[PDB]
Write a protein that binds this DNA or RNA. Structure first.
Ligand SMILES: [Zn+2]
Ligand SMILES: [Zn+2]
Lengths: 239, 239
DNA sequence: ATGTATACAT
DNA sequence: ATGTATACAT
């Protein structure tokens, strides 16, 4: 936002994700106010917003501490997204989707197919990730329920939890621009099952889709330990 | 808490749940501060805590509005708890549970069996609900993951979402003190599947268990429209 | 209105 | 330390 509190959130978030403000660090109002050249008031607001964002934990006595995240927490958070995305898909199958909503998601699927040429590596890496995030948002709202959309989007809220999190500009190597051809099939399958009222298949595929990220992350560890810093908010991991 | 902000949260929550502060009502700092005889400062804190609690929504321009909840939102929220509790059970099966943790949950299951005599209506309604809430907390932490415990407990956070929500003192009628005999079997089944590393069964039963509440609520609508007010936070429903 | 700084109490 | 009231700007 155009406010000190708004800016404070953006700055503090950046510092937390960069590792600058490490996990387990207690953030004091007085000292954070000093760091941001603002008073305690917009700081309290920022700390309260970053708390609902899940980057900070409120302490028992009062006060805030930066949340600790291990590779364990990356694994589980991806699993929860999968479970949630699966629930979003299953409910769309069980309950039905309006023609309008189905047209929208089918259109995004078509646009995502346009990102593929003919070769194993000929793929618009930047154009895909932007559309992929559109798909996941549509799927979250697809069953019609707001409560579901809200909760599904929250499970895909953390930086490593995000759908297009394991799609940065630098991780453009052959081991990830080949996996995407298959992820597009999963996207097609999700919709195709929803249309077919195949709840089991819908949930199953939507879960297996999130497992693509866990798969990609496990390759970044074993094949590029320096590209670890590249993933949006993977630098903050204490492992 | 022993603070104005702490008290403010407790009061505001009470007013929201009672319907006194209806859903869709914008809460202004100045006017809430007047209502609570406190200044804007502990109010801002209360509004920020009730926001992370999910009883208030932040508005685009700034400000807070009381969240609207329909019977649709009760249905979906129960479903999400089920999905989450299922995930907590499935992961406990897939990953394994320490002897200590398994002893604890098995002990709670035993204590819950003590709440049953021999007749269809001979059941400690107050003693069950308190132990039932212990079970659900144990199950949430059973797979060992903190991230899972945290997210499972959140899906069981809303007043109607809670495990022992459809177990108040007045809803002591024969249509709910008979259902509990079967819910104890579901509790046994959950643990028995976890021990047996039967992931499918664990998730399946844990989901079907939450459906007991949706079943109970659907009977309260069709058979006791005045006992609607009795459920902890069901008064705030705009249907 | 909410944003903000700040003085005083703990 | 965080809690709190409050004056001033929007
Ligand atoms: Zn995707
Ligand atoms: Zn239960």
């Amino acid at each position: 936002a155009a406010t000190h509190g708004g800016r404070a959130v953006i700055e503090l978030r950046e510092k937390i994700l960069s590792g600058e403000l490490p996990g387990g660090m207690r953030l004091f109002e007085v000292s954070t106010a000093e760091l941001l050249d603002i008073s305690r008031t917009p700081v309290r607001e920022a700390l309260s917003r970053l708390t609902e964002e899940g980057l900070l934990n409120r302490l028992p006595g009062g006060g805030f501490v930066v949340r600790r995240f291990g590779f364990a927490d990356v694994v589980d958070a991806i699993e929860v997204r999968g479970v949630m995305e699966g629930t979003a898909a299953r409910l769309a199958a069980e309950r039905g989707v309006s023609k309008v909503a189905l047209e929208e998601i089918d259109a995004t699927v078509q646009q995502l197919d346009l990102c593929f040429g003919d070769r194993v590596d000929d793929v618009d890496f930047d154009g895909y990730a932007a559309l992929n995030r559109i798909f996941h948002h549509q799927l979250a709202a697809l069953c019609g329920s707001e409560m579901i959309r809200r909760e599904v989007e929250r499970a895909s809220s953390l930086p490593f939890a995000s759908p297009s999190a394991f799609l940065p500009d630098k991780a453009n190597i052959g081991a990830f621009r080949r996996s995407l051809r298959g992820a597009q099939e999963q996207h097609k399958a999700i919709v195709a099952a929803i249309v077919a009222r195949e709840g089991a298949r819908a949930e199953a595929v939507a879960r297996e889709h999130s497992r693509t990220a866990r798969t990609n992350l496990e390759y970044m560890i074993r094949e590029a330990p320096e590209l670890i810093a590249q993933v949006p908010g993977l630098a903050l991991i204490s492992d």
